[PDB]
Ligand binder design. Structure first.
Ligand code: NUM
Length: 185
């Protein structure tokens, strides 16, 4: 792809984080802690899952960023509406305001309803995410495999400002402690 020139500098919004997440000083990395991280609760925090939003809001234009997923067993990545549900149980779907892909139990899937199987020959260590607001497109790229396309959501109905979306996943196995990292431009 040739989307790299739309690169944006994403930072994580501490106030939206699940209370077990640990965000680095530079707000560019996040991992699952082994306990509650001693923060107050608020209506913005994701309660049920290890999720956090980017601070940046997008309502127009073309945006691109990259995320490092090295040595993770489970994660979700993409964008979501600013007004997505934060509390209780929900599925990641465009009907609920999410445009995402994930790794789970050694398979990759797009967060459609129902979910769509992805075909990845080279397990990615870094994911590129492209958003074209006006066109209604969210695309995912395999940076480890020379930028090959993973998935395109088209005919998106964003219906609000968008925020970068992250889920570091649970670590029940002891094999999923590694962080998500926003990669440098
Ligand atoms: O699991 C990982 N590191 C643990 C992070 C940590 C744990 C405890 C602590 O006190 C401070 C830092 C990892 C990091 C990079 C790639 C893969 N795995």
């Amino acid at each position: 792809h040739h989307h790299h020139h739309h690169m944006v500098h994403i930072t994580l919004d501490r106030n939206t984080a699940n209370s077990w997440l640990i965000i680095s000083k530079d707000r560019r990395q996040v991992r699952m802690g082994d306990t509650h991280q001693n923060v107050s609760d608020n209506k913005e925090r994701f309660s049920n899952y290890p999720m956090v939003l980017g601070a940046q809001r997008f309502s127009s234009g073309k945006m691109y960023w990259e995320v490092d997923v090295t040595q993770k067993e489970a994660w979700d990545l993409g964008v979501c509406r600013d007004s997505v549900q934060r509390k209780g149980q929900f599925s990641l779907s465009p009907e609920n305001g999410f445009w995402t892909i994930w790794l789970w139990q050694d398979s990759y899937e797009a967060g459609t309803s129902p979910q769509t199987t992805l075909h990845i020959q080279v397990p990615p260590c870094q994911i590129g995410i492209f958003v074209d607001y006006e066109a209604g497109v969210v695309s995912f790229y395999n940076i480890t495999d020379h930028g090959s396309l993973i998935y395109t959501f088209s005919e998106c109905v964003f219906a609000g400002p968008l925020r970068p979306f992250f889920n570091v996943g649970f670590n029940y196995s002891g094999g999923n402690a590694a962080p998500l990292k926003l990669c440098p431009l």
